[PDB]
Amino acid sequence: MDFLDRNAAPLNEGEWQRIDEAVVSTARRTLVARRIIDVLGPLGSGVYSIPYSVFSGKSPTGIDMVGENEEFVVEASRRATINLPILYKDFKIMWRDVEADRHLGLPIDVSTAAVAGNFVAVQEDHLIFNGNVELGHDG
Amino acid sequence: MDFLDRNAAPLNEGEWQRIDEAVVSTARRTLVARRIIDVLGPLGSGVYSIPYSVFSGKSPTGIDMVGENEEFVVEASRRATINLPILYKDFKIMWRDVEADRHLGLPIDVSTAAVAGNFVAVQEDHLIFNGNVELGHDG
Numbered sequence A, B: 001m002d003f004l005d006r007n008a009a010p011l012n013e014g015e016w017q018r019i020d021e022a023v024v025s026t027a028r029r030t031l032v033a034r035r036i037i038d039v040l041g042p043l044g045s046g047v048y049s050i051p052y053s054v055f056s057g058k059s060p061t062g063i064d065m066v067g068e069n070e071e072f073v074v075e076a077s078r079r080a081t082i083n084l085p086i087l088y089k090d091f092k093i094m095w096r097d098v099e100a101d102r103h104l105g106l107p108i109d110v111s112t113a114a115v116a117g118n119f120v121a122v123q124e125d126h127l128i129f130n131g132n133v134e135l136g137h138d139g
Helices: A013-030 A095-102 A111-129 B013-030 B095-101 B111-130
Strands: A049-054 A078-083 B049-051 B081-083
Touching: A013 A111, B013 B111
Parallel strands: none
Antiparallel strands: A049 A078, B049 B081
């Protein structure tokens, strides 16, 4: 997959492996929802929307010695589809900190990346507990 | 030379060359005396005192087809002597600065050495023009 420029950024892959770790270790800290609600997928970037059933109603169960009536089918009280927004935040590794790594040995301040990861996770929770009005989600 | 310790010190030759050049250049800016007065020698460390002739006398010059007469010798009115004082000043280079230059390449604060060079050059001029009482050097 090509929409993330893993080779175009100046950062060596050791620094990538520190930045992803500095995201994941604050996602796991910050998220509540994934402790309550099971994850489905992940599905990849392409899955723009998902259809889902809503069994809001109750309807009778059959009981028969013969087993013949067919009224006793479960409905789906509605059927719906929901669109997956992008959650995102931008963090800004300033250029001379790279040279400070290159020559002064003092490694990059990835805490910007950690704070971005936290802001993303907090938006994920905020969306899940309180659906965004503009997107018309519900939480 | 032996007395000049340049091997137990931590500093590289690439530091020494900078420090000495900063001293020399600060002297050559600062001094007046080495303009009006010529350098004799230098003689090395080990000369504590110098014998020197005083002429201080007016006498004719020989002018003849064969120059029989020997009246015309230059006479040392007195063959006096003088002792060479040390002028010095001392300065510190912090261990932090050394270890910084030895890992991070941040150059030594040789402005200390320049300030010492300036102060000794000022004392050289003060000795030469004003003399000194305690040494007994007439200026």
